[PDB]
Ligand binder design. Structure first.
Ligand SMILES: Cc1cc2nc3c(=O)[nH]c(=O)nc-3n(C[C@H](O)[C@H](O)[C@H](O)COP(=O)(O)OP(=O)(O)OC[C@H]3O[C@@H](n4cnc5c(N)ncnc54)[C@H](O)[C@@H]3O)c2cc1C
Ligand SMILES: Cc1cc2nc3c(=O)[nH]c(=O)nc-3n(C[C@H](O)[C@H](O)[C@H](O)COP(=O)(O)OP(=O)(O)OC[C@H]3O[C@@H](n4cnc5c(N)ncnc54)[C@H](O)[C@@H]3O)c2cc1C
Lengths: 401, 401
């Protein structure tokens, strides 16, 4: 089952969460983690917000103290593994033996092929190195172009506007946050950013660029001092593909984190896994998944009687004055709206239902409602839809009653 | 690796192909096959053609002679397996131990929820039992309604017309054969069936039925003496799901046939696997996949130095006067047409290219061209597009030259 020594590839949140849980659960054998970035392990969400704005990396490091006696090989790239020999080949010339190999290599931003041979600054925002580069360009009154409608770009947009940067945004879809966001939320978020001065361009695609100007598929132009591309990510599953594991933009795993290769597991952004609400396999790119899937896989490795990963998906996004939380599915056969949807002091809750059962929820600036809604969601609650809409209802009381 | 005893669940083409290859490759340990149908193992393609027309099941049995010393438990359903205990629970009360478990349980026709409580004859066409039931209703001048635009229904359509049965067909898509068929082929096939008297209804959905009449989403009616539903299939992956394997309408496997559960493999229609041409995971529902994936998985189990499954997808469909063969992808950036596309003595070849490389081919009544085209496809050939179109070109010579 759990055979020593343990080797983990990748040193992001999923990896740290996994190795801390192994130790906490009682595994005392060797643990070695291989991390290609030459950085003390760190959390990524601040890179679009407080770090981008204030620049102190020592406020964003992950706490590894619950993971004693781990050798962290930082600035080292795993180049291949041999699943018959049970070895991993490292970029520094060394080889590591393993009893159990864990792939926690995350995902990397997709490049924009139309900006391939561009001669103006084009960045993505994934690493501390990216953030530092971008941050050095957030000069007040500079012109920033964001490509893509996802949350990371929108988080950057808010930070940039607060810094006095002019921000334009190009989105191929008809709405922002096309993945895992109710349309009601997406529409409101566009209204918010527009009111904050973001110049939004929907159903546009970047066709190329010429001397400091971006070209679009409608035949028009946008001039920018910098482009930040955020059109999604691709799983870092190359080692798994080469070694013969089942992969398709992500390594397929079950609820125990098992790949198709014996003694090899995977967790975090690199995985394609079952979403219990949809019953379909998806690559879940959330902070909560990285942490919770890592913990669950470790727990079951040390104690095989433990259940497999069972958590329902959720995330947050902090976009200026909007503290957004979203759980479960974006839609069902019914949406209930609690509160008014307004740019004047935004505060509201959405609830998605499917045949009476809660299958998703959204809170904007309403954290107190989010936790009980996640509990109701987890057990597939079917509350009175009238009470759910009635603003005199206490959802926290409901999650108990 | 290959640990005895071997137990296979399912006794269709994939299973038979797998067990014959184990024996041929030199494995002499126990093999037990569990098959829920109480039938000598048989091939399914004749069920829409020669069997449906002529009714002799002893002309469609699979040859199991290359699989000596196998116990076939026919008419027995595997109800669960315990992958820790390495046992399988059978419907007759017995339990089988395994060293290696192989899931070859295929797929079952999707039902039409709108015909759920229908009171007129509604069948699917998958088993010998189905075929016998349907065949007993192919009375000349009866009215048959086929639901779905796939090849099995179209094969039945031809057989029924030859028997003097009136045939109508309802298809939710704008074209027949929407999966894995070039549009040029799909359009021609519709022309053929229409000319043979099939009453085709495109972009229609069945909404229900009342006393011998089918209702559609355009608000209209079709009266039929029998409905045969062929709107696709769903993988029979329930045992795998219950036992904790990674599944999503099909069991995920790699090129060795490995599932996410150690000592458990899967092959055939039940699997979701990599299509090397698209590089994506798909459930491949072809006869050639069932046979060739089964052989490849068995070969590598007995001889681990053998390569994994590497075959590119292809199928045939016999639809009256049209002997159709299709390999690879339905489209690329270019289609080359060899010959005329005509209802007068149909004979033509299509070639699909992507940046000069052949990625797919179709032959209609042109078998001699199909084999060399499959060879060109397999090595990603990039022939002169002018020669490919030039009817004086010999493709067989090309596959060598
Ligand atoms: C700017 C930004 C903002 C974000 N904000 C939010 C948010 O608002 N809400 C939210 O839910 N999530 C947010 N996320 C955070 C996010 O969800 C987590 O960072 C992520 O889910 C963590 O997953 P991970 O540990 O699996 O992968 P990663 O964090 O990508 O870690 C994987 C590491 O493995 C390394 N690696 C890859 N290949 C190799 C190799 N061959 N050898 C050695 N190392 C290798 C990678 O370079 C990487 O360092 C944000 C992310 C970013 C970038
Ligand atoms: C009418 C018809 C026409 C066809 N014509 C064509 C064609 O023109 N071209 C083409 O390429 N293909 C055609 N196919 C043939 C087809 O492609 C093969 O039959 C199929 O791919 C074989 O796959 P299989 O062995 O994996 O699954 P199956 O043939 O479905 O065999 C699986 C068996 O396992 C059984 N089983 C399931 N669960 C259990 C359990 N718990 N315990 C025990 N047994 C179980 C199933 O009942 C079934 O008997 C046609 C199929 C049909 C039905």
């Amino acid at each position: 089952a759990l055979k020593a020594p343990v080797v983990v590839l990748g040193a992001g949140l999923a990896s740290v969460s996994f190795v801390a849980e192994l130790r906490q659960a009682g595994y005392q054998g060797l643990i070695t983690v291989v991390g290609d970035e030459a950085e003390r392990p760190y959390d990524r969400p601040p890179l679009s917000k407080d770090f981008m704005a204030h620049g102190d990396a020592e406020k964003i490091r992950l706490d590894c103290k619950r993971a004693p006696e781990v050798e962290w090989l930082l600035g080292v790239t795993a180049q291949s593994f041999d699943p018959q020999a049970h070895t991993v080949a490292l970029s520094d010339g060394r080889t590591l033996p393993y009893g159990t190999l864990v792939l926690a290599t995350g995902a990397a931003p997709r490049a924009l092929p139309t900006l391939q041979g561009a001669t103006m600054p084009v960045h993505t925002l994934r690493t501390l190195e990216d953030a530092r580069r971008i941050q050095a360009g957030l000069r007040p009154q500079s012109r920033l172009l964001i490509v893509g409608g996802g949350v990371i770009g929108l988080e950057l947009a808010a930070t940039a506007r607060t810094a006095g940067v002019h921000v334009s945004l190009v989105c191929t879809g008809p709405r922002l946050m096309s993945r895992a966001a109710p349309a009601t939320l997406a529409d409101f978020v566009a209204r918010y950013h527009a009111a904050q001065g973001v110049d939004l361009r929907f159903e546009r695609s970047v066709t190329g660029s010429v001397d400091g100007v971006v070209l679009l598929d409608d035949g028009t132009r946008i001039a920018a001092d910098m482009v930040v591309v955020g059109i999604g990510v691709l799983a870092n599953d190359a080692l798994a593909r080469a070694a013969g594991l089942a992969c398709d933009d992500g390594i397929f795993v079950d609820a125990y984190g098992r790949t198709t290769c014996p003694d090899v597991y995977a967790l975090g952004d690199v995985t394609r896994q079952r979403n219990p609400l949809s019953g379909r396999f998806e690559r879940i790119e959330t902070w909560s998944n990285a942490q919770n899937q890592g913990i669950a896989v470790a727990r079951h490795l040390v104690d095989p009687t433990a259940p497999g990963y069972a958590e329902l998906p959720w995330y947050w996004s902090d976009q200026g004055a909007l503290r957004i939380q979203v759980a479960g599915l974006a839609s069902g056969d019914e949406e209930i709206v609690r509160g008014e949807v307004s740019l004047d002091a935004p505060k509201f809750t959405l609830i998605e239902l499917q045949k009476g059962r809660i299958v998703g929820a959204t809170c904007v600036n309403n954290a107190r409602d989010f936790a009980p809604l996640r509990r109701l969601l987890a057990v597939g609650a079917k509350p009175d839809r009238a009470a759910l809409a009635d603003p005199a209802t206490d959802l926290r009381k409901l999650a108990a009653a």
